[PDB]
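Sample 3 of the quickstart, ligand chloride ion:
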Amino acid sequence: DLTNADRIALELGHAGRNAIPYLDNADRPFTLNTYRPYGYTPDRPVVVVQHGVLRNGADYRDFWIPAADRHKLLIVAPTFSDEIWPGVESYNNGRAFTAAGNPRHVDGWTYALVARVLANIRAAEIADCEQVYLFGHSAGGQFVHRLMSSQPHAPFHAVTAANPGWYTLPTFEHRFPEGLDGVGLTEDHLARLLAYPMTILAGDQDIATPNLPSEPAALRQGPHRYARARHYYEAGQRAAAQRGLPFGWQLQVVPGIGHDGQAMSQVCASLWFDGRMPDAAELARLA
Ligand SMILES: [Cl-]
Ligand SMILES: [Cl-]
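Result:
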């Protein structure tokens, strides 16, 4: 008799950290590692945080605590374990393919779970989800931009993909995940992707050259994540211009920060909620 909304109402009603088992993808549970600050009220923002390759959602949720306490944000980190969601295929790439290599419908992709969880937070009356912010670092920045390529944008007020290891390029020339072909996506998905004011957040010290995506499609985008971020940005610029479409993306370089999900989390919080880049002294503190 309990629904996911009922569960969320009971688990997210009080302040503090939590790890909420969630089952939507009938056979694949995951966890919401959450933080609710004292003084959270339902009108305040919800930040969805996506972990990188380590699948350390609890850690990512912890990185956002100081910003949540200052700004009264509800932090939700959908967490996909290596055991239940193995490999880049299940997490980074959204389980886009069946085992036979045929496309699954986009509402079955791992990405589509974000909006469902949000609808449940709203049905639980925990948050009205008017202003939802979506952040992902590394594998989770791969997840976020591919979510934006494949899913409705209505639930999301702001979206930042930080230091993705490599990118799905905005073109039907290559099969997903290298491009948008072979997965039932349309030119409308592409137009909506291009229009959205997504931030690509790139540390200019993310320039080390083992966990770095090293398949040929990743290598073609550049020697390191910082180069790849610039490559993605220009690819979107060209895709929009060849189509005469509006282009909403912003490339935001972070000076002196490398591949550091905690630093990139605090920079993102600063940009979104303080309206500013931290100063050099702060950035040096974070580095
Ligand atoms: Cl549901
Ligand atoms: Cl290839």
